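COMPLEX REQUEST
Ligand: magnesium ion
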Amino acid sequence: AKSKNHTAHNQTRKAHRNGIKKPKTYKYPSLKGVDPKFRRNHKHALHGTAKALAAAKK
Amino acid sequence: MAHFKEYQVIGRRLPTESVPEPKLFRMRIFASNEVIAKSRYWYFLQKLHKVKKASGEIVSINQINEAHPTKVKNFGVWVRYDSRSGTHNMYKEIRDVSRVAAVETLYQDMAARHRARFRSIHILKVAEIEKTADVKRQYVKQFLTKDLKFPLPHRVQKSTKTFSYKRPSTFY
Amino acid sequence: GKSHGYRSRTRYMFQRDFRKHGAVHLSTYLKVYKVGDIVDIKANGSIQKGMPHKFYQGKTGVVYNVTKSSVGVIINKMVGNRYLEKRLNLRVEHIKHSKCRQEFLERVKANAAKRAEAKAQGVAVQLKRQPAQPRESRIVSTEGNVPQTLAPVPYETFI
Amino acid sequence: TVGPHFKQANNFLWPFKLSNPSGGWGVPRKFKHFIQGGSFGNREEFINKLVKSMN
Amino acid sequence: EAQHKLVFVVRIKGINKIPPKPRKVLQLLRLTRINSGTFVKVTKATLELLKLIEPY
Amino acid sequence: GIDHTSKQHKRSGHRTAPKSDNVYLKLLVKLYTFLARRTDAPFNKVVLKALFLSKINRPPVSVSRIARALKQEGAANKTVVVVGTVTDDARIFEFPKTTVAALRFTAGARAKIVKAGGECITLDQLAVRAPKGQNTLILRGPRNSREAVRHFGMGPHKGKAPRILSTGRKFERARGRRRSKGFKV
RNA sequence: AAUUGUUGAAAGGGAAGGGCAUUUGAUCAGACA
RNA sequence: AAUACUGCCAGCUGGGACUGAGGACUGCGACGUAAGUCAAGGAUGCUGGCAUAAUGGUUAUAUGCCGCCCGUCUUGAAACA
RNA sequence: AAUAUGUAAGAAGUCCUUGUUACUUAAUUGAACGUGGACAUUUGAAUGAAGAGCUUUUAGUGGGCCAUUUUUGGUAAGCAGAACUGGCGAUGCGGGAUGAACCGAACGUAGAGUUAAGGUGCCGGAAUACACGCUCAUCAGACACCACAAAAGGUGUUAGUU
RNA sequence: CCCUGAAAAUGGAUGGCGCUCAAGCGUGUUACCUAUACUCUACCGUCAGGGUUGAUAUGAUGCCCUGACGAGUAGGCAGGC
RNA sequence: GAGAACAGAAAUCUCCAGUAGAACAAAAGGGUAAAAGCCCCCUUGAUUUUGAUUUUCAGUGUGAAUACAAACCAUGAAAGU
RNA sequence: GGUUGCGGCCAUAUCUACCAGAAAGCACCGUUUCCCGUCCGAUCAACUGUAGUUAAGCUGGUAAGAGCCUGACCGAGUAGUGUAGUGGGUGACCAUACGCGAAACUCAGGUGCUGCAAUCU
Ligand SMILES: [Mg+2]
Ligand SMILES: [Mg+2]
Ligand SMILES: [Mg+2]
Ligand SMILES: [Mg+2]
Ligand SMILES: [Mg+2]
Ligand SMILES: [Mg+2]
Ligand SMILES: [Mg+2]
Ligand SMILES: [Mg+2]
Ligand SMILES: [Mg+2]
Ligand SMILES: [Mg+2]
Ligand SMILES: [Mg+2]
Ligand SMILES: [Mg+2]
Ligand SMILES: [Mg+2]
Ligand SMILES: [Mg+2]
Ligand SMILES: [Mg+2]
Ligand SMILES: [Mg+2]
Ligand SMILES: [Mg+2]
Ligand SMILES: [Mg+2]
Ligand SMILES: [Mg+2]
Ligand SMILES: [Mg+2]
Ligand SMILES: [Mg+2]
Ligand SMILES: [Mg+2]
Ligand SMILES: [Mg+2]
Ligand SMILES: [Mg+2]
Ligand SMILES: [Mg+2]
Ligand SMILES: [Mg+2]
Ligand SMILES: [Mg+2]
Ligand SMILES: [Mg+2]
Ligand SMILES: [Mg+2]
Ligand SMILES: [Mg+2]
Ligand SMILES: [Mg+2]
Ligand SMILES: [Mg+2]
Ligand SMILES: [Mg+2]
Ligand SMILES: [Mg+2]
Ligand SMILES: [Mg+2]
Ligand SMILES: [Mg+2]
Ligand SMILES: [Mg+2]
Ligand SMILES: [Mg+2]
Ligand SMILES: [Mg+2]
Ligand SMILES: [Mg+2]
Ligand SMILES: [Mg+2]
Ligand SMILES: [Mg+2]
Ligand SMILES: [Mg+2]
Ligand SMILES: [Mg+2]
Ligand SMILES: [Mg+2]
Ligand SMILES: [Mg+2]
Ligand SMILES: [Mg+2]
Ligand SMILES: [Mg+2]
Ligand SMILES: [Mg+2]
Ligand SMILES: [Mg+2]
Ligand SMILES: [Mg+2]
Ligand SMILES: [Mg+2]
Ligand SMILES: [Mg+2]
Ligand SMILES: [Mg+2]
Ligand SMILES: [Mg+2]
Ligand SMILES: [Mg+2]
Ligand SMILES: [Mg+2]
Ligand SMILES: [Mg+2]
Ligand SMILES: [Mg+2]
Ligand SMILES: [Mg+2]
Ligand SMILES: [Mg+2]
Ligand SMILES: [Mg+2]
Ligand SMILES: [Mg+2]
Ligand SMILES: [Mg+2]
Ligand SMILES: [Mg+2]
Ligand SMILES: [Mg+2]
Ligand SMILES: [Mg+2]
Ligand SMILES: [Mg+2]
Ligand SMILES: [Mg+2]
Ligand SMILES: [Mg+2]
Ligand SMILES: [Mg+2]
Ligand SMILES: [Mg+2]
Ligand SMILES: [Mg+2]
Ligand SMILES: [Mg+2]
Ligand SMILES: [Mg+2]
Ligand SMILES: [Mg+2]
Ligand SMILES: [Mg+2]
Ligand SMILES: [Mg+2]
Ligand SMILES: [Mg+2]
Ligand SMILES: [Mg+2]
Ligand SMILES: [Mg+2]
Ligand SMILES: [Mg+2]
Ligand SMILES: [Mg+2]
Ligand SMILES: [Mg+2]
Ligand SMILES: [Mg+2]
Ligand SMILES: [Mg+2]
Ligand SMILES: [Mg+2]
Ligand SMILES: [Mg+2]
Ligand SMILES: [Mg+2]
Ligand SMILES: [Mg+2]
Ligand SMILES: [Mg+2]
Ligand SMILES: [Mg+2]
Ligand SMILES: [Mg+2]
Ligand SMILES: [Mg+2]
Ligand SMILES: [Mg+2]
Ligand SMILES: [Mg+2]
Ligand SMILES: [Mg+2]
Ligand SMILES: [Mg+2]
Ligand SMILES: [Mg+2]
Ligand SMILES: [Mg+2]
Ligand SMILES: [Mg+2]
Ligand SMILES: [Mg+2]
Ligand SMILES: [Mg+2]
Ligand SMILES: [Mg+2]
Ligand SMILES: [Mg+2]
Ligand SMILES: [Mg+2]
Ligand SMILES: [Mg+2]
Ligand SMILES: [Mg+2]
Ligand SMILES: [Mg+2]
Ligand SMILES: [Mg+2]
Ligand SMILES: [Mg+2]
Ligand SMILES: [Mg+2]
Ligand SMILES: [Mg+2]
Ligand SMILES: [Mg+2]
Ligand SMILES: [Mg+2]
Ligand SMILES: [Mg+2]
Ligand SMILES: [Mg+2]
Ligand SMILES: [Mg+2]
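STATUS: Structure written out below.
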C-alpha cells in the first residue's frame, strides 16, 4: 500500500484565505539582541536626560 | 480574413534626442479593417528593421480606393506561403476588376487548393498586367480570345415552394 | 537519503564572480553602518565566518545592531501565512548599503527645494510623481523624408 | 476630457451593467483577439458599436 | 493625433477558471461580473493593467 | 455570476442590544439610543455600546482608580462615569468629594463615596444632568487583569501560565522547564 | 398498515413509478351581489 | 457634381410583445402672457361578457420533452461493489 | 534572458538650535535618546477598498483524483512520481449523442428580452443561405479534448517550383 | 484532396437516417436557434446603511426608507416544527 | 623547458617559464597566492559564565552554526587574531 | 608636468618585442666594527652616502601585436520566453495574436583614472 508522498498543491490557496498578513510595524521596536555594553550605558543615558527634564519642571 | 480593404500605412521608430526625424517606411496592406491593418504593418516591419510597435509609432493610415473600379484587369499575384512540410513561393494570376477584389479570391484559392490559412500567407506583390501575352497561366488566357462567347448549359432554377406541378426544364 | 545541509545547493550562489576572486577590496571595511540603515545581503564565498544563510541572499533588511566586525540586520521572512521577524548577525563583507532609498532621498531634498522656491515665488507646485502619459499630437515632416515603401521578401535558404 | 478629478468622478460611477450585444457579437468565437477574428483585446473605436448594442 | 488617454473596458469572460493575476486586476478594475464595464485613464501604470487581462 | 471580493452576508460582529434580560437594563438602553440618535454628542454613542458589553468587558472600576482620575490636571470636579459596578478599595485613606454615576455601586464603595461627601448617581439621573455628557470623565476597568488571560497564548517561550489544577513542584516543573531536565521551555 | 375478496371508475404493443405543461373526464373552494 | 462606406443628431414616425410594483399631499421639472395644464417621485379611462364550474384548485388519463435505486465506503456507484 | 522574487515611494517625515551617559574619541569627538524651532495635504506614483486592526474557543480533514504548461523514472500505459495555476472531489445548469475533470457558465421564486459554448437536410428549435475552389473512393469523408494509423508508393486529379 | 500501403473474432454504428456542383474538405459573408449566464421588473430571504418613543389604541426583539447579495459534501451556528 | 661525474624513464644540484593546471584527513561543491598552501617560531581560546541569533521548525527539541556581553589567557613590534 | 611615500577603484593598469628618459627622487651600488639572519651578508640586519652607474628596476612611446575595456537600428527583433484560441499536423512539431527579449558574430573607438603629503629645472 503506497500512497502519495508530497505536494504543495492547494497550499497557497489556503495561505491566502486569511491573508499572508503584512509583518506589522511599531514605532519603538524592541532592543532584543542589541549589544549589552551599549544598552548598559544607554540605560544610564536616558536616566540622566530623564533627570534633567524633571529639573526643567522643578 | 473578411472582405478586404487596402491600406497605406506609415510608421517610424520613435524619435530620439540624438536621432530625431527617423526614416518613415510605408507598406500597402490588405486587411478587413484599420486595426488588423496596423497589426499587420508592425508584423512585417519587425521582419525587416529593428522596431516593434512598442518602440515605433504609426504616422498615417489611409485607405487606397481602386483607381479604375469598373476596368476589368488581369492581375499577376506573388505570394509566399508555408505548407505543412515547408515554405514556398508562388505566382498566380487573377482576372478581376480591383486589387482588393482579387486579393480576396487569392486567399480563397490558397485555402481551397493548398489548405493555407490566412496566417500562413505573405502577399509579396500584386500588380496589373499591362500587355496581354504577358499573361502566363492559361486559366486566364482563355478569357482573352477575340469575339469570345460561351453558353451556360444545364440551367437550374431555385424553386420557391416545396412542391411543383410541372417537372423542371434545364433549358437556357 | 536526501541532503539538506546548511549550504546545500549554493554551488553558484556562493561562487566568486569571474576573474574577481581574492582579497576583498579595502573599501568594504571602510563603509560605516548605523542603526536604521537599509542594507542588501549578498554572501561573499571567500569569507566563511559570519555568512548569511542562502535564504537571506538577495534579501534587503534594516540594521538593528552594530558590533565590532558585524551588523545585526532584521528581516521579515514569511513562513506559513504570515511574516516573522528574523535578526541576522552578518559581517561587513556580506552586507552593503541599499540605494533603494537614494531615489527617495534624492527626491525628498529636491521636493523641499521645489516647494521653497515655488512658495517664495507664488505657489503652484505639483510635486507628486505621475506615470507615463500617452504622447501628444505632432506634425511629422516629409521634407527630406519621403516614405520608403516596403514589402515582405520571398523565401530563400542560403545554407 | 480626463479632467483633474477623473479619479473621483470616474469612481463615483458604479460599474456599468450592460446586457449582451443586441445584435450578437459579429465573430463566431469570442475568446480570440479582435485582430484574430474574436472579441477580446483593444478594438479601438470599434468599442462603440459593441457598447451601444449592449446598452 | 495624440494617443487616447481614456478607454472603456467591458468584461467579456465569465467568472470561473481565471488565473490569479488577471483575476486581481479584474477586481481592481471593478469588472467582477460579465458584461459590466468601467472607464480607465491611460497611463503606463494602467496600460500595463489592460495588457494583463486582454483575454477577458 | 459575480466574482466576490469579500464574504457575503456577514454579520457586523458587534452587539446591538445587551444580551442581558434585565428590564431595567433595556430601559437604560432605551433612554440612551434615543439620546445617541438625537444629540450628536459622542458620549452617548460610547455609553450606548458599553451597555451591551458582557460581564468580562465590564471589569469593576475601583473607588481608588476613580480618586486617581480626579487627580488629573483640571479633572477634579469632573463627574466620573462607570458603565458597570464600582467596587470599594480599603487601600486609599482619603477619598475626594465628586459625583460618580454607575450601573452599580457596591455597599462598600457607595459608603466611601457618600461618607466623604459625594453622590452616587444612576446612569439616567446622569442623562438628565448631562444630556451631552458635559463635564463627564468615563473610566473603564482593567480588562486583561482577568485571570483567564494568563493562559491565553500559552506556548514555548511565551511565559504564560499553564492551565494546571494543583500546583507546586511535582506539577509541571521538570523536563522542558529547566536546563538540567532535558531543556527549558 | 402490509396484504386479500367483491363492486365501481380508468390505463396497459418488452416493466412501473417521477418532473414541467396543457387537452379531456371527475371533483371542489371562494367570490358576485 | 453624385453615390457608396463609416460616424453623429438632446430629427420625425409605424407595427409587436411583457410588465402596471406603489396608494392623500410633500420632490426635480415641462407647457403656458396668464388662469391653468402635463407623458414631470410606478395605470388610468371607456365598453362588453359571465355571475357561473365560466375562471381557478385538486385529481385521474392522454400527449411533447425530460427523469437509472436508495443508503453507504470511495479519487470514482445506475453499477457486473 | 522571459516568467517568478527582496526592499523603497515620508508626520514613525525633513532641516536648524543644543542637552544626557558609566559606552566611545587625541578631544563635548562620536554613538544612542531627547528639550526647543521651521514647513500641511500634489504630504510626495497608479488602481481598488460592502472598512481596518485584534482576541478567545471549537468542528471536520490529515487515502485525494483530473486538465494545460514545466518535469523524473519506464519501450510504453486509462503507469509511477514532482512544479505553478485552474478544476473534479463538495456542483447543478447549456454544449461535446454518451461520459466526475473539456468548452460555456456557477444555481432564491418568476416574467420579458439578449447571448455563450455549440448548432440550423430530417430526426431537432434554427437559411436544402449566400460565395470561391477542392474531392468520386468495387470498404470516400465528415469538427478540439476523443475514442488512432506509419514508412513508402500512384501517368487519379489539382495548383505550384526550377 | 483521393487511391494503395490498411489482418480478428454476436450484428452495428460520422449519435441515427441519409448525403456526392453535399447534408464531404479548405475558406469567406450574413441571418437564424437557446443556459439555472447577461440587462430590466415583480416577489422571498440574508446582510448593510439610514429614519422613528410625542401623547390621546393594537407588535420598540417593532414600524418606515434604501442598497447589495443568494451553488454546497464534511462541518459550524441560527430560527423554527 | 634548458643545464651538472657515476645517474639510466625515475636519486641530487641550478636557472627560466608557471592564475593555481597544486595542496588544504575524508565524499563532493564552494573558497584560498607576501594564503587558507609548504618550512619555521612561540603556544592551549579544543578554557570559564550565562543569554540572544541562523538552519531544520510547531518558529518545540536536537545537532551544527553566527554576532556580542563578562573573565582568564595565547601570539605578535603592533593593528589584530 | 616628473618623482617619492601612503593610497582608492583593481588589465583602458595585464602580456610580448623594440626605442626614449632632462632635473630631482627612486634605484642598482660600497662595507661588515656593531644589533641581527643565513650552507651562502644572495635574501635578511647593521654601517657609509663615501667609492661607481642609468645597465636594469622605474616612467613614457611604438606595434594593420595578444589580452582587456567601451559603443553600435553589426547580427537580431533572431534564439528563447509570459499570455490566447474547439489554430495547422497521424505524430514529431509548427504558424499566428498581445507582450518581454538574449549570446555568439561583425564593425568602430580606446589602452589606466585619481586622493593625501613631500619634493623637483
Ligand atoms: Mg502502507
Ligand atoms: Mg497509486
Ligand atoms: Mg497522505
Ligand atoms: Mg497581424
Ligand atoms: Mg515576430
Ligand atoms: Mg508565413
Ligand atoms: Mg435558395
Ligand atoms: Mg540529494
Ligand atoms: Mg550547489
Ligand atoms: Mg570556524
Ligand atoms: Mg437586425
Ligand atoms: Mg435577434
Ligand atoms: Mg453572434
Ligand atoms: Mg462554432
Ligand atoms: Mg439594449
Ligand atoms: Mg479605473
Ligand atoms: Mg498592448
Ligand atoms: Mg461584549
Ligand atoms: Mg476594559
Ligand atoms: Mg492577580
Ligand atoms: Mg484561559
Ligand atoms: Mg506547579
Ligand atoms: Mg413484448
Ligand atoms: Mg398535472
Ligand atoms: Mg356586494
Ligand atoms: Mg449612414
Ligand atoms: Mg436619431
Ligand atoms: Mg396600481
Ligand atoms: Mg398598486
Ligand atoms: Mg412661459
Ligand atoms: Mg401631468
Ligand atoms: Mg361557478
Ligand atoms: Mg346558472
Ligand atoms: Mg375549469
Ligand atoms: Mg361555486
Ligand atoms: Mg357559464
Ligand atoms: Mg372563463
Ligand atoms: Mg379514475
Ligand atoms: Mg398521474
Ligand atoms: Mg430520456
Ligand atoms: Mg430509495
Ligand atoms: Mg476502490
Ligand atoms: Mg470523499
Ligand atoms: Mg471512475
Ligand atoms: Mg449510490
Ligand atoms: Mg459494471
Ligand atoms: Mg531572452
Ligand atoms: Mg512584484
Ligand atoms: Mg550633564
Ligand atoms: Mg518640537
Ligand atoms: Mg497610493
Ligand atoms: Mg495603475
Ligand atoms: Mg477609491
Ligand atoms: Mg466602507
Ligand atoms: Mg480548529
Ligand atoms: Mg499520516
Ligand atoms: Mg487533527
Ligand atoms: Mg512538458
Ligand atoms: Mg499517473
Ligand atoms: Mg481547468
Ligand atoms: Mg478545488
Ligand atoms: Mg468544488
Ligand atoms: Mg461545476
Ligand atoms: Mg447537457
Ligand atoms: Mg459546447
Ligand atoms: Mg464525441
Ligand atoms: Mg471554446
Ligand atoms: Mg480556455
Ligand atoms: Mg432518428
Ligand atoms: Mg427544424
Ligand atoms: Mg437567410
Ligand atoms: Mg467502407
Ligand atoms: Mg482495400
Ligand atoms: Mg474488414
Ligand atoms: Mg459510406
Ligand atoms: Mg488538432
Ligand atoms: Mg504520403
Ligand atoms: Mg498527387
Ligand atoms: Mg518548391
Ligand atoms: Mg479536397
Ligand atoms: Mg456482438
Ligand atoms: Mg469513419
Ligand atoms: Mg453529410
Ligand atoms: Mg448531423
Ligand atoms: Mg463549408
Ligand atoms: Mg445582414
Ligand atoms: Mg445555464
Ligand atoms: Mg432565473
Ligand atoms: Mg435583478
Ligand atoms: Mg432600529
Ligand atoms: Mg446556501
Ligand atoms: Mg422557520
Ligand atoms: Mg416545540
Ligand atoms: Mg650529474
Ligand atoms: Mg572520513
Ligand atoms: Mg574539498
Ligand atoms: Mg600577506
Ligand atoms: Mg614539503
Ligand atoms: Mg572540546
Ligand atoms: Mg527549533
Ligand atoms: Mg511553536
Ligand atoms: Mg520552531
Ligand atoms: Mg511554523
Ligand atoms: Mg519535544
Ligand atoms: Mg532548539
Ligand atoms: Mg554548520
Ligand atoms: Mg640623475
Ligand atoms: Mg637590508
Ligand atoms: Mg634606468
Ligand atoms: Mg635605458
Ligand atoms: Mg620603484
Ligand atoms: Mg590589440
Ligand atoms: Mg522558432
Ligand atoms: Mg511562447
Ligand atoms: Mg494548443
Ligand atoms: Mg519524428
Ligand atoms: Mg512575439
Ligand atoms: Mg556579422
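REMARKS: The radius of gyration of chain A is 25 Å. Chain A touches chain C through 16 residues (CB under 8 Å).
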